[PDB]
Symmetry: C3
Subunit: 245 residues, 3 copies
């Protein structure tokens, strides 16, 4: 296992991503272990709040270079095995404690969490367009939904990198803390969430995210239409070989 | 007004101030406050000379939300959130309403103020959509107006976790509302009312109709969905225990 | 044609549109109206560019309707009609960066709100000031202001038509980058460079998706704005 599962207190579960070899890029291993961790959480009605973090300086790094090339060649899609919507499909609140870097799909996956916390010193980017890819994995839905239309245009079109400190200065609604405090803060917030009845938490998450769960599939189809027009050029293959990490 | 817990003052010829002054209940929705507030907005409706309304509290309180008895009657299913439509007073008013939140804004109190066209917070005061502390899902259109005014994301946190925030905390979090020291909040709302009053009433009524038409339109359905939520969560014994145990 | 707009090619893939009607302080004269439309047409006919920087001169980004034009409306004489300048950045096929190095007033502020990336100057003044003149807002203000600045700050901006410095907006948490004036255009140039690193067809395809709901919904909002304007001459 490359994802460890740590109960905190009575009803909090910490899904810690730790594929150290790949810096939390979506290796086959990290993919399957995440699916399994969330299926385990789905099957176990004790938990009231999930905390999803990485290890050391990485939250989640996005597609592996091979994984991206497989996408370029059309062997796979960004939406496979639904990694992208794990936190949205989870029935209890999920806090994405992004204590390290969040890159590409790694950032987008965390953005479907109900609560996202950033580290001041780490890097965040929705970097699809750096390779020529129009954004995938619901990025064109969840980036404006969480960060607002205007910041999303810049983030998505330019694919630039931002320190959590830069995003805090642009007015993001996410709590931004020094790396060393992100998990501690997440844990406190998780304990406050765990004070509520599980039924009230699920009933309210259902209702708050109903528009998302309703609209997302149509936004995915739209990204799939964009992807049909942009993903499959030779230039995209060159950008992936030439500019990956 | 009738109960004398709302004070109406004409600040200038076109500016009307609705001061909530239920000292006994700290501007919690007592029967008296409920009655006086409706009578006050109905007076505003019947006198179409004003251009701006300033909604404010007294001292350190803006509005405290349901009384403890009031919350207990809701969980026994004797009454509802909507019921008198207090939540939607500022949205129904045809002229712009400034919620001058000089003091604390709790529960249905906070929410009612967020339905104003302009909201101003006090730095030293406390704001909370605290329904969930008691085990209740939010009512009073909280799940519509809080995302609408503060954005989706900060709404998830405010609503799910029911925390308390000083106006400075919200300010630090990036809200769009002006945040000022308590002692400046009413002065600033008056200066703002005076600027609004530089316009023809008819432009102001016409513009607000256009701007809030999606809210007047969408709100009824969200109220429905929140009632449905209330049916699954409001009526357990543990809500009664949290109300009796965690405050009025 | 009128020389009140200057086009500079920054690199092959970057075009700078510089508003330069010094007599009118970049207010919407006939010359600046024509020239801007002719500049957006030239850009449309030349698919070599990947990014557009729209900017002003000195302390002026764009000043909106002219004193004269507004006065003529206030007393119908006439035509409350729609010139469609406000959407040049929206209809432009490639990303537009509004580098508002100077003041952005009324329809000049709004025109730049329809750009994909907006940059403000701390020192400059910004206002959707339609209602100062007794008018409900036009040119899509009531759509693009909430969309770019959030429902709440838009209610304030459009109802009261107040003036805000860059600095005030930044303290209220706007998502636009805010810089001292002397740094606004250089920062636009760098961002335009980063954008030009992308294949053009990726820029266009994404932009089309991102702004579809704005191109789709805008005409109805314009109809509503013309309605409101009609109801005001009671
Ligand atoms: Na899940």
């Amino acid at each position: 296992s490359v994802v460890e599962l740590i109960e905190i207190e009575s009803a909090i579960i910490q899904v810690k991503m730790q594929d150290r070899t790949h810096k939390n890029a979506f290796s086959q291993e990290l993919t399957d272990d995440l699916i399994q961790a969330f299926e385990y959480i789905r099957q176990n009605p004790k938990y009231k709040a999930v905390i999803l973090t990485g290890y050391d300086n990485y939250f989640a790094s996005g597609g592996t270079q091979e994984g991206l090339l497989r996408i370029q060649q059309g062997l796979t899609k960004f939406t496979d095995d639904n990694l992208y919507s794990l936190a949205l499909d989870c029935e209890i609140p999920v806090i994405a404690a992004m204590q390290g870097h969040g890159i590409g799909g790694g950032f987008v996956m965390g953005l479907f969490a109900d609560i996202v916390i950033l580290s001041r010193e780490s890097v965040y980017t929705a970097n699809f367009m750096k390779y020529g890819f129009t954004p995938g994995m619901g990025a064109t839905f969840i980036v404006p939904k969480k960060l607002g239309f205007s910041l999303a245009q810049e983030i998505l079109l330019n694919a630039g990198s931002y320190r959590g400190a830069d995003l805090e200065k642009r007015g993001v609604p996410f709590k931004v803390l020094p790396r060393a405090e992100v998990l501690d803060y997440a844990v406190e917030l998780a304990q406050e969430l765990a004070e509520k009845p599980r039924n009230s938490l699920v009933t309210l998450k259902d209702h708050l995210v109903a528009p998302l769960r309703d609209q997302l599939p149509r936004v995915i189809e739209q990204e799939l239409m964009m992807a049909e027009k942009t993903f499959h050029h030779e230039e995209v293959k060159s950008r992936i070989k030439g500019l990956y990490g």
